[PDB]
């Protein structure tokens, strides 16, 4: 099956404005894929933050967002807070059938 | 409020089947597909397979299809996983989560996951 890949792991300071992303071994993540992105905070307390590429979903902090970079999907994050030190995790759909990339440790040190 | 219950951590030898549960509350049960999720360490998050509420169709990652079996209970507005043929690769965290049917991709609320164990 394809293999989606994200950086292990990043390390950012607060209030900076830092970019994960998820790569496809097929070629280009489009937006026929649907990228979509989760949240997983200590004590695995997963949040859903943006699908379908670009669409984040309410109540998610308007400091996330979603866009294709290149041939890869992205989340941004603008302005990097203490709590946003999580594990985000992306998926792109491939016939129907989902496919999560191996998720990535954001740091944040302070 | 949204709420996604799922049942008790388990502890089941070689062999065996469990049926774990997800109770949905808070919206429209028949709306949201329900995906399942396996969580086990140095493997990221694994897709399962999802359900439409609405009919019980399923769509399953092909590693899973010999080993999944996802139904739903509307009366009840319950999603249930089981798990067959057990074995320590099937020895993870599992999670249920919704997605609209009507054209949002994106995954908003999550059960809190639970425990499975194969050993012995």
């Known amino acids: 099956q394809a293999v989606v890949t994200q950086e292990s792991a990043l390390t950012t300071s607060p209030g900076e404005t830092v970019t994960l992303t998820c790569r496809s071994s097929?070629?280009?993540?489009?937006?026929?894929?649907?990228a979509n992105w989760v949240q997983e905070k200590p004590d695995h307390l997963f949040t859903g933050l943006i699908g379908?590429?670009?669409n984040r979903a309410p109540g998610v902090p308007a400091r996330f967002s979603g866009s294709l970079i290149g041939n890869k999907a992205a989340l941004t994050i603008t302005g990097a807070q203490t709590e946003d030190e999580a594990i985000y995790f992306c998926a792109l759909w491939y016939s129907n059938h989902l496919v999560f990339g191996g998720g990535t440790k954001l740091t944040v040190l302070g | 409020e949204v709420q996604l219950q799922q049942s008790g951590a388990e502890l089941v030898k070689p062999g065996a089947s469990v049926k774990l549960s997800c109770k949905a509350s808070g919206y429209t049960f028949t709306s949201y597909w329900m995906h399942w999720v396996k969580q086990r360490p140095g493997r990221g998050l694994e897709w399962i397979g999802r359900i439409d509420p609405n009919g019980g169709g399923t769509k399953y990652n092909e590693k899973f299809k010999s080993k999944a079996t996802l139904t739903v209970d509307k009366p009840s507005s319950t999603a249930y996983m089981q798990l067959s043929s057990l074995t320590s690769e099937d020895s993870a965290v599992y999670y249920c989560?919704?997605?609209?049917?009507?054209?949002?991709?994106?995954?908003?609320?999550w059960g809190q996951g639970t425990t499975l164990t194969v050993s012995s």
């Open positions: 989560a919704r997605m609209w049917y009507y054209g949002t991709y994106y995954f908003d609320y």
């Open positions: 379908g590429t670009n």
């Open positions: 097929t070629g280009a993540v489009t937006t026929s894929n649907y």
